[PDB]
Amino acid sequence: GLVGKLVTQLEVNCDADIFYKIVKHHEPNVIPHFFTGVQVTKGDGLVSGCIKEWNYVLEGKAMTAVEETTHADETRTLTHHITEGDAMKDYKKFDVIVETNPKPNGSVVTYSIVYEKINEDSPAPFDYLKFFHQNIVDMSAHISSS
Amino acid sequence: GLVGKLVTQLEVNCDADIFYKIVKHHEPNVIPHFFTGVQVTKGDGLVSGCIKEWNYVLEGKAMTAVEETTHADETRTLTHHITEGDAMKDYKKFDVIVETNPKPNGSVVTYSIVYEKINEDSPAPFDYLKFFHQNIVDMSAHISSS
């Protein structure tokens, strides 16, 4: 089982398009972290994404990652493509996809971690899944109606 | 974020229908556990599922659960419906759905935990997700071609 996907899906009381625009322009200050990096444009001058080098602390351990982020407004989807860092000691591929859709009924938010392990001895990224989950729960608790 | 779903999805080198029949009739002896219970029939005499009371040790702690299992051969789906036990101290609802499908390309196996927390102070079931993940990885490593 070398190729796989972990998912955490949450219901949020908020319109999908609004919530996506919030997620797209926001990060969890309690968590030690910062980034440096650049904005990417499509060629008309308006940002289409970013490339960031993160310095962060996960389960007590300091780590780095380089991620390229792209977005698709029409499907309310953010994609983080990790190319380098501590995660690449365990994974050949590590992508994080964030989707927001309206309930058939507010909204449903889906974090997916699409991964390929280096070898069988690599863990699956349950530590990252819980991290992203708690971060989006925290951000969702500071948003409210009206 | 009280209602949600956790998913672990794995690729396995095995035909989907065969793998489903394996999963359907198998349990991880390393893990302390046993069950008692009964078989359920649809009314023609052939088993359609089971109702089991599990005694198991999760992350060092002894727990119990009562689960009703049903299956759908045509969609290769097993459904475990938990009605009682330690998990119900955290969740109003706790269902585990196991699906096996062929790759568009072997197979893709999907464990989903569909949950509703009692309150905001309840955890999401990352401990169960990792447990089910490692159990299906273990079972998949003992299966091989030909």
Written account of the structure:
The structure is a homodimer of 146-residue chains. The first copy, chain A, is α+β, with helices and mostly antiparallel strands. Chain A has a single domain, classed as START domain (Alpha-D-Glucose-1,6-Bisphosphate, Chain A, domain 4, 2-Layer Sandwich). In chain A, 17% of the residues lie in helices and 51% in strands. Chain A is built from two helices and seven strands. The first copy, chain A, has a seven-stranded antiparallel sheet. Chains A and B meet through strand 1 and helix 2 of A and strand 1 and helix 2 of B. Strand 1 of chain A pairs antiparallel with strand 1 of chain B, so a sheet runs across the interface.
